[PDB]
Each structure stands twice: as structure tokens, then as C-alpha cells.
Design an enzyme around this catalytic site. Structure first.
Site, mmCIF file in Angstrom:
data_model
loop_
_atom_site.group_PDB
_atom_site.id
_atom_site.type_symbol
_atom_site.label_atom_id
_atom_site.label_comp_id
_atom_site.label_asym_id
_atom_site.label_seq_id
_atom_site.Cartn_x
_atom_site.Cartn_y
_atom_site.Cartn_z
ATOM 1 C CG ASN A 82 7.303 4.978 -4.715
ATOM 2 O OD1 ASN A 82 7.668 4.108 -5.297
ATOM 3 N ND2 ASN A 82 5.898 4.811 -4.622
ATOM 4 C CD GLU A 131 -0.969 -1.010 -4.923
ATOM 5 O OE1 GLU A 131 -0.622 0.445 -4.879
ATOM 6 O OE2 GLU A 131 -0.487 -1.361 -3.875
ATOM 7 C CG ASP A 175 4.919 2.191 -6.589
ATOM 8 O OD1 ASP A 175 5.788 1.810 -6.418
ATOM 9 O OD2 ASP A 175 4.108 2.549 -5.757
ATOM 10 C CB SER A 231 11.415 3.574 -6.141
ATOM 11 O OG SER A 231 10.472 3.782 -5.114
ATOM 12 C CG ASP A 272 12.053 4.740 -2.294
ATOM 13 O OD1 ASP A 272 11.283 5.226 -3.315
ATOM 14 O OD2 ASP A 272 12.180 3.635 -2.089
#
Ligand SMILES: [Cl-]
Ligand SMILES: [Cl-]
Ligand code: NA
Length: 129
Positions: free
Chosen positions: A46, A35, A52, A50, A48
Site C-alpha cells: 500500500n 482482493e 496486504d 503497509s 502508506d
């Protein structure tokens, strides 16, 4: 902060992630490797809209507030920037909520694609823990 592999294992263990929801420590270290490359400051947008955040790339659609993810929630009740701290407490506490949400570590797509079913104990080899 860029953690060493065994440095991160020891912190995750101290914070109770070793076999949390049945997931051994190596699963958590492997997920963080792919990650964030063990970097607490990692961020990734991301598709969409959003983002991380942090060592375990926790997402702003559900788990933290970043003020720029429409229609999102903040179920860990924290600003997403708290997930970038050198102190992993907030990331671990939130990760415990995420892995409890129903699909276990499959919530982390990189865990499912790169760690699940592999020799995850390799990630803690050599560590004094
Ligand atoms: Cl393990
Ligand atoms: Cl599970
Ligand atoms: Na949010």
C-alpha cells in the site's frame, strides 16, 4: 494455493463466515475474488508502506505483524506470513475481527467498490455447500 470458487466457498462456510456479522457467504467469496483472485499467496504493498496479505488482503497497519510497518499494530496476533498459508484458518479468524471493528465489510475497499450492492449470491452458484 489458488482456490477454486466453490472450494473457497466451502472452506469459508466451514470456518463460520456464512453470515458472520450478517454477511452472506457470497459477500466473502466476492471479496476474496477481487482482493486476491482466490490466491492465498497474494501480497500488495500500500501507499502508506503497509502491505496486504492473503486471500482477503489483510493489512499490516492494524492486523498482523510484518516487521516493516512503522507505528502499526498486530491485533490478530499473527505474523502476516501466516495469512499466506494454504490453510485459511488464520485469515478467517482475523477477518472476523476486522469485520467486527465497526464498519462491517467496508473495511475491504474492494468489497465496497465491487461487491457491495451487487448480486453476490452469484459467487456461490453451482456450489454443493
Ligand atoms: Cl450469498
Ligand atoms: Cl454491517
Ligand atoms: Na503490523
Amino acid at each position: 494455493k489458488v482456490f477454486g470458487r466453490c472450494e473457497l466457498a466451502a472452506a469459508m462456510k466451514r470456518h463460520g463466515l456464512d453470515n458472520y456479522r450478517g454477511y452472506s457467504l457470497g459477500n466473502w467469496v466476492c471479496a476474496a475474488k477481487f482482493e486476491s483472485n482466490f490466491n492465498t499467496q497474494a501480497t500488495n504493498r500500500n501507499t502508506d508502506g503497509s502491505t496486504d496479505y492473503g486471500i482477503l488482503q489483510i493489512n499490516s497497519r492494524w492486523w498482523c505483524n510484518d516487521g516493516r510497518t512503522p507505528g502499526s499494530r498486530n491485533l490478530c496476533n499473527i505474523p502476516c506470513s501466516a495469512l499466506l498459508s494454504s490453510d485459511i484458518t488464520a485469515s478467517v479468524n482475523c477477518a472476523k475481527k476486522i469485520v467486527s471493528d465497526g464498519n462491517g465489510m467496508n473495511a475491504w475497499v474492494a468489497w465496497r467498490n465491487r461487491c457491495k450492492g451487487t448480486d453476490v449470491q452469484a459467487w456461490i452458484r453451482g456450489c454443493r455447500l
